[PDB]
Curated annotation (Swiss-Prot), chain A:
Annotated function: Component of the 26S proteasome, a multiprotein complex involved in the ATP-dependent degradation of ubiquitinated proteins. This complex plays a key role in the maintenance of protein homeostasis by removing misfolded or damaged proteins, which could impair cellular functions, and by removing proteins whose functions are no longer required. Therefore, the proteasome participates in numerous cellular processes, including cell cycle progression, apoptosis, or DNA damage repair. In the complex, PSMD11 is required for proteasome assembly.
SUBUNIT field: Component of the 19S proteasome regulatory particle complex. The 26S proteasome consists of a 20S core particle (CP) and two 19S regulatory subunits (RP). The regulatory particle is made of a lid composed of 9 subunits including PSMD11, a base containing 6 ATPases and few additional components.
Gene designation: PSMD11
Post-translational modification: Phosphorylated by AMPK.
Localization (cell): Nucleus; Cytoplasm, Cytosol
Tissue expr: Highly expressed in embryonic stem cells (ESCs). Expression decreases as ESCs differentiate.
Stimuli inducing this protein: By FOXO4; expression in embryonic stem cells (ESCs) is mediated by FOXO4.
The protein's name in its UniProt record: 26S proteasome non-ATPase regulatory subunit 11
Family that this chain belongs to: Belongs to the proteasome subunit S9 family.
Species per Swiss-Prot/TrEMBL record: Homo sapiens
Highest taxon listed in the record's lineage: Eukaryota
Segments forming a coiled coil: none
Lineage, uppermost ranks: Eukaryota, Metazoa, Chordata, Craniata, Vertebrata
Residues of the full protein shown: 160 to 211 of 422
From Swiss-Prot, chain B:
One Pfam family in the UniProt entry: Proteasome_A_N
Region listing for Disordered, in residue ranges: 239-254
Species whose genome carries this gene: Homo sapiens
Main location, first listed in the record: cytoplasm
Family that this chain belongs to: Belongs to the peptidase T1A family.
Gene: PSMA4
SMART domains for this protein: Proteasome_A_N
Known function: Component of the 20S core proteasome complex involved in the proteolytic degradation of most intracellular proteins. This complex plays numerous essential roles within the cell by associating with different regulatory particles. Associated with two 19S regulatory particles, forms the 26S proteasome and thus participates in the ATP-dependent degradation of ubiquitinated proteins.
GO BP: any one term: proteasome-mediated ubiquitin-dependent protein catabolic process
Protein name listed in UniProt: Proteasome subunit alpha type-4
Induction: Down-regulated by antioxidants BO-653 and probucol.
Swiss-Prot record, chain D:
Highest taxon listed in the record's lineage: Eukaryota
NCBIfam families on file: PRK03996.1 (NF003075)
Lineage: Eukaryota, Metazoa, Chordata, Craniata, Vertebrata
Keywords: Acetylation, Cytoplasm, Glycoprotein, Nucleus, Phosphoprotein, Proteasome
UniProt gene name: PSMA6
A Gene Ontology BP annotation from the UniProt entry: positive regulation of canonical NF-kappaB signal transduction
Name listed for the protein in its UniProt record: Proteasome subunit alpha type-6
Organism: Homo sapiens
GO cellular component: cilium; cytoplasm; cytosol; extracellular exosome; mitochondrion; myofibril; nuclear matrix; nucleoplasm
Chief subcellular location: cytoplasm
Swiss-Prot record, chain H:
Residues modified by glycosylation: 129
Name this protein carries in UniProt: Proteasome subunit alpha type-7
Family indicated by similarity: Belongs to the peptidase T1A family.
This protein's encoding gene: PSMA7
N6-acetyllysine modified-residue sites: 226
Amino acid sequence: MDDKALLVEVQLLESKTYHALSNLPKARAALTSARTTANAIYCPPKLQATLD
Amino acid sequence: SRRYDSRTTIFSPEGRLYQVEYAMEAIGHAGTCLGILANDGVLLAAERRNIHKLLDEVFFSEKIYKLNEDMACSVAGITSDANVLTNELRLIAQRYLLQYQEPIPCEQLVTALCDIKQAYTQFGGKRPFGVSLLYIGWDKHYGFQLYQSDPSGNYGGWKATCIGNNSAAAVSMLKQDYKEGEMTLKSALALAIKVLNKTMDVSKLSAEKVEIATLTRENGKTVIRVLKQKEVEQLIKKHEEEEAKAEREKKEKE
Amino acid sequence: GYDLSASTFSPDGRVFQVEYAMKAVENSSTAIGIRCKDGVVFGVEKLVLSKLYEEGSNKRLFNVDRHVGMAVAGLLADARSLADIAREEASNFRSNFGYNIPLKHLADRVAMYVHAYTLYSAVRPFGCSFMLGSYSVNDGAQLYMIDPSGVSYGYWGCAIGKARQAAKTEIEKLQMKEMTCRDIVKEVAKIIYIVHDEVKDKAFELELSWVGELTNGRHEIVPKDIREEAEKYAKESLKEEDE
Amino acid sequence: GFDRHITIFSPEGRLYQVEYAFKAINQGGLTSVAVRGKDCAVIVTQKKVPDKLLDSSTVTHLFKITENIGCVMTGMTADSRSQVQRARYEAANWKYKYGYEIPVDMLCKRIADISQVYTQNAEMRPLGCCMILIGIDEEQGPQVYKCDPAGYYCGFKATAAGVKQTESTSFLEKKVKKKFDWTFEQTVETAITCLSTVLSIDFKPSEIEVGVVTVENPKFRILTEAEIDAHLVALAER
Amino acid sequence: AEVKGVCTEAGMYALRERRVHVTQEDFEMAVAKVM
Amino acid sequence: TNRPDTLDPALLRPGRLDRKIHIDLPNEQARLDILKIHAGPITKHGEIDYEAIVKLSDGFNGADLRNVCTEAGMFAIRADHDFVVQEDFMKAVRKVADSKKLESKLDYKPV
Amino acid sequence: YSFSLTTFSPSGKLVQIEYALAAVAGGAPSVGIKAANGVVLATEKKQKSILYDERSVHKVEPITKHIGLVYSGMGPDYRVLVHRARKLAQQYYLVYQEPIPTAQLVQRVASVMQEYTQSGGVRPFGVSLLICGWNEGRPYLFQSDPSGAYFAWKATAMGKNYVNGKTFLEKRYNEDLELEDAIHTAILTLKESFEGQMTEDNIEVGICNEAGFRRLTPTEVKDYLAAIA
Amino acid sequence: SYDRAITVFSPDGHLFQVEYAQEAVKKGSTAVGVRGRDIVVLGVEKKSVAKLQDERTVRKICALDDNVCMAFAGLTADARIVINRARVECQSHRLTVEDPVTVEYITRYIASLKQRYTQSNGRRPFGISALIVGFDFDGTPRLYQTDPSGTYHAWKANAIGRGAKSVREFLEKNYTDEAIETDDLTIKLVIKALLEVVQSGGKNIELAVMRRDQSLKILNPEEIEKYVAEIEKEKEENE
């Protein structure tokens, strides 16, 4: 169900969770997925700042 | 003397009716439809231009309509003109039934609708019906019959024919590989499938892109049934198997 | 937007064939109508095109009813058609409701007929503009003007035809609201003679009429003696102006 | 192909003859403003009599469709009178057929449907007049509606028609941004001052026509010269 | 043409993140931006 | 300009032509002022209903009102009078109104 | 006139109907989504000033206690077509004392559009209609075209950005939706193209379920907008 | 209520639209008609009948009554309209007068209909030419040709359509009492006339015949082939 906005938010949360728990071979991948998904939408300022 | 008249029903410097032939080529642009006769029954396949994913399925058909108990038609061209023509066909058939207490013969109904078509092409300033009809029916005079009528009001009886997009190629193929005193419904369905494939080469004949309606006789009653998705998929799979086998045979020979 | 039909609007939102009908209207000789305090007086500068016609051979003053008289300007055929239409409107009104048609109502009905003809392209606008005049004891003296577009407006003094502007200035130089018809007749004759262009038309006749209290709310042609006196007044006025 | 008659759809829509009907409405030369208060509806309109020979009593763009419904017409005057007669006939027929006074919204719907038929058919032209109807509805209060030659009949809190339609609409927009709960005098003054400001003219009691319907007196009244002068004097003093 | 634009924009993303080698993330972002 | 609709949008841009002011046709008071300005030097020897002249001058421009004054003077000379009167002014304004029938669209706006 | 003004072009196309389609596509956005238990017709009802009383002219109109109808295109053409649809439904009821099936109503409105395409002195209707209905125990959404052709839709959009709306509906739409969820989807699709803040008054929505078609009040539309913000 | 003048005179006094109807006729398949002692023969070019097309539904030869038949050349829809109207008129004539129609009577009726359509409002001419062949009650062969303009003449041999001119000159030559003595010889003459234009015989040919007051009989393709074969025999004997 493509919206990409809650998708970017959830992928950022997963990135943070992996950063906290499973080091950064998976947090980096989740962050890359979030950035790629965000690049296809407007990314309101809050979401863009969270990404950055 | 009007400036806005547009002179729909006039002749041309040559005896060529511009509006009628523009309607003919509108038919040509419209979706494909074809019909095949066979000793056991008649069938009518039709490409579907409503292949959009968000488009619901509420009727039993979109290109194919039922005129009376033992007769169906298929329309190519303009959908609204087709709807009005099908309503008029139903009215004509039921008027004949009310008057004579027996189903209207297929040729008689085709002639009546074509009389209406000719009236529109000769009288008044109204544009002709840009619709071509393929009628498949049964009657106690010549049994299973297939007719094809054009916007000009001209109809012809055929054993196998095609109207619409790539209709020329479809009719050429049918001419090449249609057998007169043979080809029961099974082979007729196979032929229709292969013709639709080579007529819609762009798409590999997805079962959802075509509609087939078969008219047959059972216990003295006439049954007109639209082939379900299951049967259409079975037919497409069989044709694909046959085509692969033919290609393998040709390559092995070479 | 062309101008070949009344059903076509110009790019400016201006129906051009109605304007051409008005152009045809301002080519007839002239017709003034002055609403005095106790009547209405019509005068027409009837141009005798040839001496072969009889005086009164092209009457531009018609009796639309007992109490209503119209003076037309433009195409005489269209003017006669509109006069017949107004006559039948008045007759129908009297037969249906049982009393003389008010001039305002009759003018509105005829103007709406003219609008009916200026609407569609299956017909053409009337090529004549007319003035209606009446007097009644219970409704005063009323004068209306209707043009090819179908615009009925009440007036105290109106002029149609070629020299409508000159006639309008001459009429404005009057205290119409406080004069009597017996004198407004002389004033109308004077105005006709002043606005007439001798060098341009030469031959000329004056066709007068009034409807007022002195006529018991009845439209009539001016008596011969009164018309001659008014014509003499106009001649002497022209002589004095020349001197 | 043909932007000469309505029934052609120049190849993006754009019914050019209907647009030309609107241009004709503007070309009429006059302006009219309509407002509605908490309990009153008012329609002012510029009154021009450039002759001194005109009766000045027959030069009126305020008409009484029925005893309880008034209207102000803008644009071609012949078309205005024709549409006013049609509106009166429709109102009378509604009263005869249904047994109660025609609502203003329904009346505007009737005339708008007629104009739509004109735009739909090629034989006719869309007659170039703008009608603004005023009435008191038994439940909706002071209804004010405006029908146009295309068949649009939206109901308005305050609208205008004529050459300065846009400026009048902007002025009424500014006024209705704030405290739209207008008494009878307040709404009459709003309409009069809107017209005066837009036309850059100090109005004498002569060259304006004011029509009013109030809940207490739901009878379309054309204010006399004396009442118009009283309102104008109060406006000047304030 | 769009594929070539994707390659060029992947290079541009590698440039934006000052770096000498274009990577999978750069190609992903390039595809997202181009489409 | 009097044909602003034909100007380049880059020229009409707010950065180049910042303030676009509309010198519209005179209203009632503007016509009165212009008529007074252009009839001040004319030797009038009557009572001049400038209000009536303005009422008949609907749709006129400033040059049209100046021509109204000039035509009143022309009527004066043609009548061999060393002055002007309201009859002359009324004739002049009606003459100019008739002359105005040969015009075309004038309400041209930018954008 | 009696001579048709919609004639076939040398390329076999009805340019008059094509231009009517262009007029429709230039109209206000509208969306129709049929859920598992109902249908929703939403539309942009943006006025050009707050002067316009947005409670007199309704963008979504009911034609029967189980059928509603929204449009995209010309408002007056929509008015005449909705009046004709109401008359057709009443005639059907009178003949058969049973509310007209939605399929039949759309068929007859399409026939009206076709006969206005064919007739002599007339113009094709410059509107596309989005009938919704709850005949039987199923929801129906039909789009009727200026050409007089009617298509059954699971969900569709017509107006300014109708192609974008249709893509959005394809991405966001599933057969398992429920009426209150399809309303969310419809308002979200309208927001996809809406130019400005979406107030509860400058938008209009009408639902159609077992109870019957009803145009949601501005209060309910406000609540939906708040839940969707 | 269209009420528009479709056919009007051109400045040089021509009815260009009935001329265009005649052009529509000339661009139709050839139809030949001959009359002999006791038989009227009526052949027509099948004009590329597809293997898949039921030849019964193509009827360029139609029986208007028991004693009158009609060969067509033009627009098939107008063919059907005129043929149906002629059949109705023939039954009406049988009603009013207890005799079968005469070929001249039916030809006159068709011509009157064509003229009505050529000078009625909002109606274009019937773009068709017709060959009415039949027998009267007195037992006399009759052949008439009617043009779209409502002009009908009585002929001894016509050919209307694409090869009208060539077939007409061929029939003008080699048409004589000796050549029409027998029914077979008359059929030979018609088949030769058709062969003069149709590139391939047999396939592109359809013959109907009427003997004296018996019935209309459509010659089967085998019979047509036999006639063509013996025509070839006669030709090769000559050469």
